[PDB]
Design an enzyme around this catalytic site. Structure first.
Site, PDB file in Angstrom:
ATOM      1  N   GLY A 188       2.315   4.986   2.171  1.00 21.84           N
ATOM      2  CA  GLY A 188       2.821   5.398   3.465  1.00 21.84           C
ATOM      3  C   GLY A 188       3.667   4.291   4.072  1.00 21.84           C
TER       4      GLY A 188
ATOM      5  N   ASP B 191       2.947   2.283  21.506  1.00 21.89           N
ATOM      6  CA  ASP B 191       2.299   2.961  20.387  1.00 21.89           C
ATOM      7  C   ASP B 191       1.185   2.094  19.807  1.00 21.89           C
ATOM      8  OD1 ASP B 191       2.112   5.105  18.476  1.00 21.89           O
ATOM      9  OD2 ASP B 191       3.193   3.813  17.033  1.00 21.89           O
TER      10      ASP B 191
ATOM     11  N   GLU C  19       6.659   0.139   2.292  1.00 22.36           N
ATOM     12  CA  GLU C  19       7.930  -0.426   2.692  1.00 22.36           C
ATOM     13  C   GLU C  19       7.874  -1.955   2.663  1.00 22.36           C
ATOM     14  OE1 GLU C  19      10.351   1.382   2.514  1.00 22.36           O
ATOM     15  OE2 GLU C  19       9.150   3.216   2.501  1.00 22.36           O
ATOM     16  N   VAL C  20       6.663  -2.490   2.572  1.00 25.89           N
ATOM     17  CA  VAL C  20       6.466  -3.920   2.566  1.00 25.89           C
ATOM     18  C   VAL C  20       6.127  -4.431   1.183  1.00 25.89           C
ATOM     19  CG1 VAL C  20       5.352  -5.780   3.752  1.00 25.89           C
ATOM     20  CG2 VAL C  20       5.573  -3.546   4.801  1.00 25.89           C
TER      21      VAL C  20
ATOM     22  N   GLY D 221       0.825  -1.183   0.000  1.00 26.05           N
ATOM     23  CA  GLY D 221       0.000   0.000   0.000  1.00 26.05           C
ATOM     24  C   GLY D 221       0.859   1.232   0.000  1.00 26.05           C
TER      25      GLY D 221
ATOM     26  N   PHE E 294       2.870   1.107   4.446  1.00 28.80           N
ATOM     27  CA  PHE E 294       2.727  -0.072   3.627  1.00 28.80           C
ATOM     28  C   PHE E 294       3.583  -0.165   2.367  1.00 28.80           C
ATOM     29  CE2 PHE E 294      -1.410   0.614   5.828  1.00 28.80           C
ATOM     30  CZ  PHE E 294      -1.408  -0.517   6.625  1.00 28.80           C
TER      31      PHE E 294
END
EC number: 2.7.11.17
Length: 279
Positions: A20, A122, A24-25, A18, A22
């Site tokens: 933002g 968090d 990075e994956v 995806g 996501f």
């Protein structure tokens, strides 16, 4: 760390999850088993080694680790159900039982962490992803404002009890669609927060069970020591009992979520379509 000449020797990459966070994956297919997986490339050790052994149904696992070149490749367990809010908004039928099964799983996962010595710190609605697109799908804790614990904000020594506040907050939102703390300018909001000023507002909370309200209060307790532990919350009749109602509260909840948690689809989106497309 299994060495690898090239990570692509093992997996066939597809698309990213995806935007933002996501982006990075990487979604990839295991050449051997053809199993779909999530892969995070950590450019380049013990934290990772710790994560490797964290095993819980409701937390997103780190299945395997491969070292290739100057990077670490974390083969993560893949989820395809998308974001919490997205799904609820498109539910049609949502109740206190659904909210309680969700809170349960979070507490179940968090207590697991506390027993393991870890504190989340968090913990928020964005970190929750449905395991899959199935209706019975379980919610999962992925990564590893009003959400952050009061004692934290007050710059006091945090405790594992920070997570329990966050969970109460989440529970609140799941029962109404709007955050329990809000105000025009931060300063005025922050006092509300640091003083735990919130209410089960007249119109919105007309059909919610008093039990749910009680459960929430005890987690959304400004006094850390007077605050329910993850274990206590799990013992509460709302979680372990039969007090959650099955009245459809979808309308107000759905309506409030759209107004309170609206954002672009290009902001921080989980492209569920990309997974299901290669599923």
């Amino acid at each position: 760390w299994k060495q690898a000449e090239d990570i692509r020797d093992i997996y066939d990459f597809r698309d990213v999850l995806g935007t933002g966070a996501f982006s990075e994956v990487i979604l990839a297919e295991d050449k051997r088993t053809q199993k779909l997986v999530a892969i995070k490339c950590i450019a380049k050790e013990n934290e990772i080694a710790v994560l490797h052994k964290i095993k819980h149904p409701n937390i997103v696992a780190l299945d395997d680790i491969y070292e290739s070149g100057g990077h670490l490749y974390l083969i993560m367990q893949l989820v395809s159900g998308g974001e919490l809010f997205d799904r609820i908004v498109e539910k049609g039928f949502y109740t206190e039982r659904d909210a309680s099964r969700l809170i349960f799983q979070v507490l179940d996962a968090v207590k697991y962490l506390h027993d393991l010595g870890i504190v989340h710190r968090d913990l928020k609605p964005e970190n929750l992803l449905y395991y899959s697109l199935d209706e019975d799908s379980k919610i999962m804790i992925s990564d590893f404002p009003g959400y952050v614990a009061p004692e934290v904000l007050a710059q006091k020594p945090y405790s594992k009890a920070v997570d329990c506040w966050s969970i109460g907050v989440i529970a609140y939102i799941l029962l109404c669609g709007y955050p329990p703390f809000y105000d025009e300018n931060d300063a005025k909001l922050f006092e509300q927060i640091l003083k735990a000023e919130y209410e089960f507002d007249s119109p919105y909370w007309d059909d919610i069970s008093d039990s749910a309200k009680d459960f929430i209060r005890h987690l959304m307790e400004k006094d850390p020591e007077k605050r329910f532990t993850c274990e206590q919350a799990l013992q509460h009749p709302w979680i372990a009992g039969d007090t959650a109602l099955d009245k459809n509260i979808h309308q107000s909840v759905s309506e409030q979520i759209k107004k309170n948690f609206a954002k672009s689809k290009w902001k921080q989106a989980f492209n569920a379509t990309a997974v299901v497309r290669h599923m």
